[PDB]
Amino acid sequence: KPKLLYCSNGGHFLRILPDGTVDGTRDRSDQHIQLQLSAESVGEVYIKSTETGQYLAMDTDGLLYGSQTPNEECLFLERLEENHYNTYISKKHAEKNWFVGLKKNGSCKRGPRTHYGQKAILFLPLPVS
């Protein structure tokens, strides 16, 4: 089943627009916030927009963007945090410890500006319903 990824930080939902853009919206009713989480290997996943077929991927500069094709930049390490929040780490830049995160305003928080402990890197997976 598809999910909604909520960021405790601004109380935003992870969104990927068809223009490749990735930000956060508070509108639980937006079509571009439903994603399908795919397990590639163990602890690894693919995050995909059910609407556009876009994959969430992270550039070399730590910027989030939507990808038309599944690739290296699209895998993330899924971590279940003790508080029952999830964290996602770019697999390509794991050694850098670059996370998926959103500012409080809902803007994408760049991978190297993120860090463990931040509220911007804690997501909660919700039912679309």
Swiss-Prot record:
Transmembrane portions of the chain: none
GO biological process: activation of protein kinase B activity; anatomical structure morphogenesis; angiogenesis; branch elongation involved in ureteric bud branching; cellular response to heat; epithelial cell proliferation; fibroblast growth factor receptor signaling pathway; lung development
Tissue-level expression: Predominantly expressed in kidney and brain. Detected at much lower levels in heart and skeletal muscle.
Compartments it resides in: Secreted; Cytoplasm; Cytoplasm, Cell cortex; Cytoplasm, Cytosol
GO cellular component: a single term: cytoplasm
Effect of residue 85 to A: No effect on integrin- and heparin-binding, loss of FGFR1-binding, defective in inducing FGF1 signaling, cell proliferation and cell migration
Record bears the keyword Metal-binding: no
Keywords associated with the record: Acetylation, Angiogenesis, Cytoplasm, Developmental protein, Differentiation, Growth factor, Heparin-binding, Mitogen, Nucleus, Phosphoprotein, Secreted
Post-translational modification: In the nucleus, phosphorylated by PKC/PRKCD.
Chain positions covered by the region annotation Heparin-binding: 103-119
Reported function: Plays an important role in the regulation of cell survival, cell division, angiogenesis, cell differentiation and cell migration. Functions as a potent mitogen in vitro. Acts as a ligand for FGFR1 and integrins. Binds to FGFR1 in the presence of heparin leading to FGFR1 dimerization and activation via sequential autophosphorylation on tyrosine residues which act as docking sites for interacting proteins, leading to the activation of several signaling cascades. Binds to integrin ITGAV:ITGB3.
Subunit structure: Monomer. Homodimer. Interacts with FGFR1, FGFR2, FGFR3 and FGFR4. Affinity between fibroblast growth factors (FGFs) and their receptors is increased by heparan sulfate glycosaminoglycans that function as coreceptors. Found in a complex with FGFBP1, FGF1 and FGF2. Interacts with FGFBP1. Part of a Cu(2+)-dependent multiprotein aggregate containing FGF1, S100A13 and SYT1. Interacts with SYT1. Interacts with S100A13. Interacts with LRRC59. Interacts with CSNKA, CSNKB and FIBP. While binding with LRRC59, CSNKA and FIBP seem mutually exclusive, CSNKB and FIBP may cooperatively interact with FGF1.
Family: Belongs to the heparin-binding growth factors family.
Protein name per UniProt: Fibroblast growth factor 1
Taxonomic classification: Eukaryota, Metazoa, Chordata, Craniata, Vertebrata
Gene coding for it: FGF1
